[PDB]
Write a protein that binds this ligand. Structure first.
Ligand SMILES: [Cl-]
Length: 246
């Protein structure tokens, strides 16, 4: 079971004396490797556990888990062994939703409550939007990922890997857009929200609205950029996260 569980997590920089572990949950089309710089930046005080969803990179042959709830169910089991220190969650876009669902479910699932939720690039769970005004073409979604460079973009360049990963991007996209929150629910931990100032799917009001999803303090940081603002704006985010986790 642990060997299977370990397929879901990558520890790019062991931090045996970390005061907290930070579970990092990528966007649609994003893999664990997205958080390699963050693991290096937060160690030794915080240990990053970067989540590898089925269908990603080394898991490319596994069918995507097709719903937020299915991902959450599986991740709850993955995170069982980390109750010896505080656990915090960070997610971008789809990852933000999975982070929120994990935080809500953890106590009834038998896991200690998380100490903090960082929600990046995502409107509050209660905030509804109809279909993207831009549509969601294969070309746009792949182009956004290509722009980021790194390992995920390198994969997309190979037409054989592209053919396999495109349906995973599509599955992820559909999972997030079909996701519906359970009305009335609130986590108990602090929520710190990061959003780009021109992400067309996250208004400042929708980002502030994360306050309706916690009984604890909610914080909002608007950073310059679009949906993937967090790449170019990594430093102040890391600074804020370090401060919050200290
Ligand atoms: Cl996403």
């Amino acid at each position: 079971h642990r060997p299977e569980a370990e397929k879901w997590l990558r520890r790019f920089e062991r931090a045996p004396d970390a005061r907290a572990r930070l579970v990092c949950l990528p966007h649609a089309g994003g893999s664990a490797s997205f958080f390699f710089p963050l693991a290096k930046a937060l160690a030794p005080a915080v240990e990053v556990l970067a989540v590898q969803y089925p269908g990603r990179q080394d898991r490319r042959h596994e069918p995507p888990v097709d719903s937020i709830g299915g991902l959450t169910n599986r991740l709850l089991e993955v995170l069982r062994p980390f109750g010896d220190r505080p656990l915090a969650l960070f997610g971008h876009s789809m990852g933000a939703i999975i982070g929120y669902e994990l935080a809500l479910r953890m106590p009834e699932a038998g896991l200690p409550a998380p100490v903090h939720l960082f929600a990046s690039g995502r409107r509050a769970p209660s905030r509804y939007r109809d279909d993207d005004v831009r549509g969601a073409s294969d070309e746009r979604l792949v182009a956004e990922l290509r722009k980021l460079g790194g390992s995920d973009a390198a994969m997309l360049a190979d037409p054989e890997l592209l053919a396999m990963v495109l349906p995973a991007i599509r599955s992820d996209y559909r999972a997030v857009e079909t996701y519906r929150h359970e009305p009335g629910r609130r986590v108990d931990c602090p929520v710190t929200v990061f959003t780009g100032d021109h992400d067309p799917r996250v208004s400042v009001g929708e980002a502030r609205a994360w306050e309706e999803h916690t009984t604890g303090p909610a914080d909002l940081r608007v950073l310059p950029g679009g949906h993937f603002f967090l790449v170019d704006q990594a430093a102040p985010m890391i600074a804020t996260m370090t401060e919050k986790l200290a």
